[PDB]
From Swiss-Prot:
This is Lipopolysaccharide 1,6-galactosyltransferase. It catalyses: alpha-D-Glc-(1->3)-[L-alpha-D-Hep-(1->7)]-4-O-PO3(2-)-L-alpha-D-Hep-(1->3)-4-O-PO3(2-)-L-alpha-D-Hep-(1->5)-[alpha-Kdo-(2->4)]-alpha-Kdo-(2->6)-lipid A + UDP-alpha-D-galactose = alpha-D-Gal-(1->6)-alpha-D-Glc-(1->3)-[L-alpha-D-Hep-(1->7)]-4-O-PO3(2-)-L-alpha-D-Hep-(1->3)-4-O-PO3(2-)-L-alpha-D-Hep-(1->5)-[alpha-Kdo-(2->4)]-alpha-Kdo-(2->6)-lipid A + UDP + H(+). Pfam families: Glyco_transf_4, Glycos_transf_1. Gene3D superfamilies: Glycogen Phosphorylase B. Pathway: Bacterial outer membrane biogenesis; LPS core biosynthesis. It comes from Salmonella typhimurium (strain LT2 / SGSC1412 / ATCC 700720). InterPro entries: Glyco_trans_1, Glyco_trans_4-like_N. The gene is waaB. One of its GO terms (biological process) is lipopolysaccharide core region biosynthetic process.
Amino acid sequence: AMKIAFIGEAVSGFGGMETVISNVIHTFENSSPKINCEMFFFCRNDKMDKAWLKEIKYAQSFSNIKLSFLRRAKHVYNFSQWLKETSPDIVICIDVISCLYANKARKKSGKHFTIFSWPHFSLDHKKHAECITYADYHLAISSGIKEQIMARGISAQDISVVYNPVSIKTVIVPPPERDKPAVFLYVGRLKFEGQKRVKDLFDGLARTTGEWQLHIIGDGSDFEKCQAYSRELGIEQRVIWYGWQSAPWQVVQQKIKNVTALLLTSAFEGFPMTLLEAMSYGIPCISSDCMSGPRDMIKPGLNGELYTPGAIDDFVGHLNRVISGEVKYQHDIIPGTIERFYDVLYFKNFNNAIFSKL
Ligand SMILES: O=c1ccn([C@@H]2O[C@H](COP(=O)(O)OP(=O)(O)O)[C@@H](O)[C@H]2O)c(=O)[nH]1
């Protein structure tokens, strides 16, 4: 009879991380008859949308004390009391600050349990990275995060790389027929520079050789700035804008139908779920080799390419070769190149990472 507690600071209730957590919780509560799951949130308000939790048992610590020393002390106390009521065997922290809370509350509460980190963002691009050292073991969604954890002094043996899940598909998006233009796809929020660097996408494509089209599914404040840039570069007649779409992969299948590659030019990424989605549909991905994620999914020459951050020359080379056919990715086998990310095997490896450390 195992009970697992997932804890973190309040989240919005919409986002990639929330989806992964509710699914991991839900399949946990079916695994061994039903080893039980519940949540604990540290909140300064109750603005978190509760939809994703409708089937999940959860409790909260509310404190809007403005001095953070006092607020954290109250959070630790509230969690210490919940620990006594609940007696979890395992506590998994979905952010780094909660590893400190869980550690301090374990000592205060006198309870025994094992503390795992399971952060969903690169430690270096987020606020409280040094609190990672308060967890017992670590669940890393990428090789990049495992490296940042080791950088703080943690032994590699105490860190399991668990990736993140994606659903198996039963449709393959084929390449365009030969003699048709190459079809590139960009799916994501538009930022001209900043995190997403749509500037780099447009700069690279403008320098390429051969016939191509770019389909952009997404929106953002930089829309007009990106549209002006495509006009400036003279590529606007090869770009089709779809705005934000609730079902981007339905738009791909029904409206675009044939895709050469998905492109991602980001400066950084928390976890680029978009790449996994694309490869689940057999679409190769050419991505910047940024912190973090793309290098754990992309196998160069097999399901796409990586380029060193800022190496737009290299990015262009990858585009030219896939347009010409000098390099060809086989869409029919690409879905199998991300085997370890698919739901069932993901959960088996995730489950084994938790219980192997006990
Ligand atoms: O028009 C869009 C563009 C993005 N996505 C989805 O949003 C995620 C990636 O979006 P984003 O680039 O904003 O990543 P984030 O910054 O939210 O982590 C992927 O799962 C996409 O399938 C979507 O549903 N509609």
